[PDB]
C-alpha cells in the first residue's frame, strides 16, 4: 500500500525527525511540526536566526565554495573574474598586511573624515559644498546619506525610469533604536563605541594624538545628528499605501517647496542632481520630473541641518560609508565591527570568511555564479514540472474570484486581467549557460587584481551605481531578471507584474520531481500562490497588469478589501513573541506577507484537490500515521521551522515585513477550515478559533 522508494524514505525521515508526535496538532502545530527540530538544533554562534531557509542558504554557500575555489582551463572570462574575486576575498594574509592603508587612500576622495583629520576646516571645509559632498558618496560609491537620490522604474509608466528622492537608510536597523533607552541602550552605546574604535585606529594609522574625550564628544555629536535625522523619517505604517507615497513634481517645484540651508550656503537641487548624473554624461534641467517619496522628511530636515556645520555633517556622511568598508580591511578593523554586531544581532563570532566571500561574489556577479550553480546543483528538466504547477495555481486563483462575496463582478474581470498577464520566471535565464558572449560583455568593464580586494569592492561599487544611473533615459529591460539563480527565496515585482522562483528554492523540502506531490503542493505550491497573491495584497492591489500605479478597484470592493484584511491586522497584532520579551507583532507592517501566506496555502490546497480529482490518490509514506491531506499541511509548517536570538528578535519585530516562523504557521492554519478538517480539531481549540480572517 505505502511507497518504499529512496525519495519517499528521505521525505519520511526528515518529516519524522522534524516533528514531535507527543504534542496535539490542535494545541500548537508549530511545536507539533518543528518540536523535534527545536530539540536537536541550536542557533550557530555566527547566525542570529536558524531554520530550514538558513540551513539551505548555508548548504547553497558550500556549493558556491566548491565551484569558485577550483579553477578550470575550459572556463570563460566572466567565470575567471568571479573565481579571481573569490580568491582575492578569502586571502586574509594579503588583506591583513595592508591594514587600513586602502581606507586612508579613499578618505581624501570623500572629503575626508573630520574626527580622524587635523585642520579639516582649512583642507576641505573651506571649499566644501553639501551638493558635491553627498553627490560623491552617491555617484562614486552608491552610498546614500541625508538625501537618498536614486534612479528606478516609474510607478505610473513601468517601461520608463525616473529620479526618486526619499529618506536615507539609517545606521541602526530602524528609527525605533535612536530612542536609546531600555532594550536599545545596549545597541546605541556599542554603535558610538564602534565609531570611536574605527576613528582611533585611523588616527593610530596616520600617527596623530589620540584624545579620548575629543573622540567621545565628536562621535556623540554624530549620534545626536542621526537621532534628529532618524526622528524626521516617516514610520513604515505611513509608507504602506503607494498612492499616498507617489508625489511626482519637477526640480523647479522641489527648489520652491523643499529648500535647504546647509552650512550657510542654500542647497541647489539642480547643481546636486547634475553633480550625480554628470558622472554618466547626462544633463538635467529644472523641467526634469522627480518622484518625491519623502516630502514630510525634507520639510522636517530644513530646521535640523541649519544648526550643524560642514564638519558635523561630513563626520556622519563619512562614518556611514566607512561602517560598510570595515569588513573589507584587516582583522584589527573587523574586531571593532564584531563587538557592535554582538549588541545588535547577538552573534558571538564572525561568519566564516569563505561564506562571506561566496555570498559577496554571488551578489556582485549574479549571472556568473548562477551559471556555475545551475551547472552543478540544478537539474534543468525540473523547470517543466514547476511551469505546470504555476499554471495550475494561476487557474485556481481565478476560480476563487467567482466565489468571493466582497468583490463586484467588474473588479473580478479586472483581477483576472492581471492574473493571466502575470509572467513566470523559473530556475535561471537560459542566456547564462548557452550565450557566453552576453555574459562576458556584462563583466567586461571589470578588471580584478587578486592582491587588491579593497580596490575590487570599490570597483564593484562604481560598476553597480554607474549601471543604474545609465538607465534614466532607457526603456526598462523586460528580459532582465530581478534575482540571481543561486538564491533560496521567491519574489513578486509589482512594476513588472512578475513571479520569480530561482533554482535555490526549487529543491527539498519545497520541490522535487521524485518526492510526493502532497509535499510539492505543501512546499513550492504554497510559495507559488504566495508570490501570485502579492499581486493583490495591500500594496500589490494598486498596480494594473502592466505594473502601473492606477486604481482598478470600485469604492465598495476597495472598502471591502480594507474591512476584510483589517481582520488579519488585528489577528497578528494579538501575537506576543516570547523570544522578543513578549512584545506584540506589528500587524500593519506584516499584513502584505500575512495576506500572501493565507492566500497561497488555500490556493495550493485546492490545486492539490484538483490533482486528487484528476489523477486520483498516491501511495502513502512509511512510518507515519498521517494521510496525504495532512502531509501537505505538515510540509508547509516544516518550511518555517526555526528559532531567533532575542537581540535579533527585537530587530525583526520593528524592521522585518514578514511574521516570525511560528506565527506564519499558527496564524494561517487558524484561518484554515481545511486544516481543522484534515487534523479533526474541535471548535474553540487554539488552532481552530471561531473568527477566521480570509481575503484570497
Amino acid at each position: 500500500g505505502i511507497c518504499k522508494s529512496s525519495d519517499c524514505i528521505k521525505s519520511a525521515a526528515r518529516l519524522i525527525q522534524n516533528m514531535d508526535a507527543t504534542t496535539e496538532p490542535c494545541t500548537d502545530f508549530f511545536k507539533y511540526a518543528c518540536g523535534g527540530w527545536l530539540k536537536r538544533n541550536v542557533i550557530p554562534e555566527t547566525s542570529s536566526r536558524y531554520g530550514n531557509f538558513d540551513i539551505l542558504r548555508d548548504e547553497l554557500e558550500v556549493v558556491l565554495k566548491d565551484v569558485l575555489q577550483e579553477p578550470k582551463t575550459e572556463d570563460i572570462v566572466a567565470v575567471q573574474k568571479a573565481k579571481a574575486l573569490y580568491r582575492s576575498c578569502i586571502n586574509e594574509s594579503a588583506i591583513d598586511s595592508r591594514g587600513g592603508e586602502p581606507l586612508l587612500k579613499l578618505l581624501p576622495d570623500i572629503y575626508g573624515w573630520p574626527v580622524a583629520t587635523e585642520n579639516w576646516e582649512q583642507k576641505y571645509g573651506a571649499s566644501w559644498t553639501a551638493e558635491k559632498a553627498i553627490a560623491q558618496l552617491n555617484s562614486k560609491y552608491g552610498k546614500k546619506v541625508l538625501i537618498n537620490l536614486f534612479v528606478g522604474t516609474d510607478d505610473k509608466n513601468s517601461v520608463n525610469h525616473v529620479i526618486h528622492i526619499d529618506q536615507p537608510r539609517l545606521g541602526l536597523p530602524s528609527r525605533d533604536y535612536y530612542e536609546c533607552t531600555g532594550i536599545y541602550k545596549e545597541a546605541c552605546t556599542a554603535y558610538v563605541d564602534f565609531m570611536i574604535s574605527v576613528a582611533r585606529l585611523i588616527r593610530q594609522e596616520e600617527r596623530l594624538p589620540i584624545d579620548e574625550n575629543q573622540l567621545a564628544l565628536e562621535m556623540n555629536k554624530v549620534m545626536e545628528l542621526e537621532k534628529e535625522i532618524a526622528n524626521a523619517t516617516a514610520k513604515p505604517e505611513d509608507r504602506n499605501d503607494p498612492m499616498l507615497l507617489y508625489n511626482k513634481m519637477t526640480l523647479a517645484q522641489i527648489q520652491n517647496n523643499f529648500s535647504l540651508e546647509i552650512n550657510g550656503k542654500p542647497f541647489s537641487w539642480l547643481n546636486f542632481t547634475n553633480e550625480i548624473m554628470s558622472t554618466v554624461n547626462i544633463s538635467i534641467t529644472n523641467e526634469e520630473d522627480v518622484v518625491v517619496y519623502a516630502p514630510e522628511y525634507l520639510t522636517k530636515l530644513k530646521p535640523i541641518l541649519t544648526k550643524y556645520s560642514a564638519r558635523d555633517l561630513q563626520n556622519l556622511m563619512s562614518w556611514r560609508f566607512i561602517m560598510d568598508l570595515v569588513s573589507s580591511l584587516s582583522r584589527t578593523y573587523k574586531e571593532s565591527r564584531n563587538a557592535f554586531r554582538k549588541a545588535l544581532y547577538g552573534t558571538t563570532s564572525e561568519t566564516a570568511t569563505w561564506r562571506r566571500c561566496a555570498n559577496y561574489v554571488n551578489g556582485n556577479m549574479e549571472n556568473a555564479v548562477g551559471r556555475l550553480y545551475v551547472e552543478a546543483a540544478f537539474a534543468g528538466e525540473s523547470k517543466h514540472v514547476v511551469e505546470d504547477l504555476i499554471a495550475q495555481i494561476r487557474e485556481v486563483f481565478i476560480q476563487t474570484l467567482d466565489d468571493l462575496t466582497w468583490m463586484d463582478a467588474e473588479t473580478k474581470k479586472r483581477a483576472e486581467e492581471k492574473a493571466l498577464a502575470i509572467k513566470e520566471r523559473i530556475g535561471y535565464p537560459d542566456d547564462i549557460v548557452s550565450n557566453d558572449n552576453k555574459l562576458n560583455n556584462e563583466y567586461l568593464e571589470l578588471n580584478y587584481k587578486e592582491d587588491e580586494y579593497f580596490e575590487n569592492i570599490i570597483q564593484n561599487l562604481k560598476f553597480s551605481q554607474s549601471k543604474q544611473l545609465k538607465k534614466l533615459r532607457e526603456k526598462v529591460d523586460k528580459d532582465e531578471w530581478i534575482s540571481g539563480a543561486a538564491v533560496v527565496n521567491a519574489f513578486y515585482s509589482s512594476g513588472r507584474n512578475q513571479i520569480v522562483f530561482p533554482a535555490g528554492i526549487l529543491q527539498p523540502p519545497f520541490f522535487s520531481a521524485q518526492q510526493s506531490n502532497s509535499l510539492n503542493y505543501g512546499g513550492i505550491g504554497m510559495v507559488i500562490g504566495h508570490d501570485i497573491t502579492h499581486g493583490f495584497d495591500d500594496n500589490g492591489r494598486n498596480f494594473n497588469k502592466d505594473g502601473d500605479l492606477v486604481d482598478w478597484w470600485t469604492q465598495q470592493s476597495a472598502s471591502n478589501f480594507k474591512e476584510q484584511s483589517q481582520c488579519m491586522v488585528y489577528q497578528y497584532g494579538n501575537f506576543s513573541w516570547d523570544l522578543a520579551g513578549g512584545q506584540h507583532l506589528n500587524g500593519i507592517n506584516t499584513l502584505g506577507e500575512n495576506i500572501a501566506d493565507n492566500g497561497g496555502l488555500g490556493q495550493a490546497y485546492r490545486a492539490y484537490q484538483n490533482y486528487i480529482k484528476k489523477n486520483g490518490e498516491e501511495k502513502l509514506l512509511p512510518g507515519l500515521d498521517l494521510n496525504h491531506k495532512q502531509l501537505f499541511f505538515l510540509n508547509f509548517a516544516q518550511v518555517w521551522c526555526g528559532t531567533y536570538r532575542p537581540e535579533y528578535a527585537v530587530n525583526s519585530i520593528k524592521t522585518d515585513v514578514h511574521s516570525p516562523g511560528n506565527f506564519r504557521i499558527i496564524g494561517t492554519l487558524q484561518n484554515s477550515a481545511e486544516f481543522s478538517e484534515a487534523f479533526h480539531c474541535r471548535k474553540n481549540s487554539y488552532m481552530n478559533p471561531e473568527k477566521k480572517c480570509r481575503v484570497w
Binding site: A490, I505, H658
Partner: peptide
Amino acid sequence: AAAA
C-alpha cells in the same frame, strides 16, 4: 520575498 518569502523570507529575509
